[PDB]
């Protein structure tokens, strides 16, 4: 019941799944959603459709939580990283500024053999 | 001896007791380590790109100097021990290489 008006939305996206997290303008979360949240089980989870549904779910949630205008930040890559974006757009939340935050490092950690 | 440029970036929230004090201890480290002073420019309060010591901005100083080479590293040991100074960068001078010239 924090009744929060305008806020920020993190879209994290991997090849295995997607997750939206809605949060307050200083960053503490409000609701979150994912491919497992909505009914999806396996690989099926990282489809764009599930990303649509995920976004939409977290949108409905945050809206009944009192949201209106939203600033999006995107981390990651994989199918329907964009569908979550198209979703949040038409959600009824208003899209303020979409940003891309995907963290890349300056070469610190020796990646897993799968990733080299 | 050689010619260096000493950069200092220290906390912006000081007053003039503290500003006096820190600038004087800068002097002290130079006198002690034998660095004569060519110019000085105090750039002052400027907005950094990324936060240093959690701080969104900084207070900037530039001292062109000459000094005995071999102690420049200890000179920086001392300038760094100071708590209210969060960056020191000392560099030997270069001739002004131009471009679009």
């Amino acid at each position: 019941k924090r009744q929060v008006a305008s806020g920020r939305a993190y879209i994290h996206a991997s090849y295995n799944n997607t997750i939206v997290t809605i949060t307050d303008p200083d960053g503490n979360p409000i609701t979150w959603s994912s491919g497992g949240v909505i009914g999806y089980k396996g690989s099926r989870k990282g489809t764009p459709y599930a990303a649509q549904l995920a976004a939409l779910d977290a949108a409905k949630k945050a809206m009944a939580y009192g949201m209106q205008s939203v600033d999006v930040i995107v981390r990651g890559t994989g199918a329907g990283r964009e569908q979550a974006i198209r979703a949040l757009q038409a959600s009824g939340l208003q899209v303020k500024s979409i940003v891309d935050d995907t963290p890349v490092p300056h070469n610190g950690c020796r990646p897993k053999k799968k990733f080299r | 001896m050689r010619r260096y440029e000493v950069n200092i970036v220290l906390n912006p929230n000081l007053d003039q007791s503290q500003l006096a004090l820190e600038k004087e201890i800068i002097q002290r480290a130079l006198e002690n380590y034998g660095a004569r002073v060519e110019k000085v420019e105090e750039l002052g309060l400027r907005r950094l790109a990324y936060p240093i010591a959690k701080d969104p901005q900084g207070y900037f100083l530039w001292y062109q100097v000459e000094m005995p080479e071999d102690r420049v590293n200890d000179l920086a040991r001392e300038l760094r021990i100071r708590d209210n100074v969060r960056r020191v960068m000392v560099v030997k001078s270069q001739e002004p290489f131009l471009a679009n010239a």
Binding site: - | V9, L48, P96, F97, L98, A99
Partner: protein, 70 residues
């Protein structure tokens, strides 16, 4: 498009403290631009690099930023 040095005055390519200019050599994110877009040459670019990284340490030019749109 046009290169960077295509509009610029005579300027110290070794002077780190000057941000107004060095800034024109970064991208939408922090990343130093490639020769193609900075219109420099070998010794040129190669200097600009060290100039820039020197300024990044002094906290003037960013090590990175974020990207709008996307």
């Amino acid at each position: 498009k046009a290169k960077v040095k295509a509009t610029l005055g005579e300027f110290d390519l070794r002077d780190y403290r000057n941000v107004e200019v060095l800034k024109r050599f970064l991208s939408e994110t922090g990343k130093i631009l490639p020769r193609r877009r900075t219109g420099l040459s070998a010794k040129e670019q190669r200097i600009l690099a060290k100039t820039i990284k020197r300024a990044r340490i002094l906290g003037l030019l960013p090590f990175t930023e974020k990207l709008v749109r996307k």
